Amino acid sequence: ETATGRADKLEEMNGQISARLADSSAQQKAVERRAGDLNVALERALDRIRALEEEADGLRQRHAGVDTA
């Protein structure tokens, strides 16, 4: 008896609001993809920053030598 009723209620909400959990997790997965693209952009930007450092180094040498000249 009571198993029958309490269960029936249990399966019902468990079903619908579990699928709800799946959907909210799905928007969270969209946020995950956003974060991953953000991350890879972060590393590539940092690598560009480094390359900028050496490039400015080179600019400094080609400033200094011609100053000497």
Partner: protein
């Protein structure tokens, strides 16, 4: 003159990350205690009903 120049790099850069990550440090610091606002009342909410499920258990006795 190369020496003065090339070594000028990090000092500006490292300060920047000093200027960068420290700001994050106090930024992500209060992030912890911000949750503490949500924790305490919940802790009460947990305390509020953990004792009452036995009270519900006690009401279940009124059966």
């Amino acid at each position: 003159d190369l020496k003065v120049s090339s070594l000028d790099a990090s000092l500006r850069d490292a300060t920047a990350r000093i200027e960068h990550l420290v700001q994050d440090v106090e930024g992500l610091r209060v992030q912890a205690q911000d949750i503490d606002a949500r924790r305490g009342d919940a802790e009460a909410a947990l305390a509020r009903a953990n004792q009452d499920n036995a009270l519900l258990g006690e009401e279940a006795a009124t059966l």
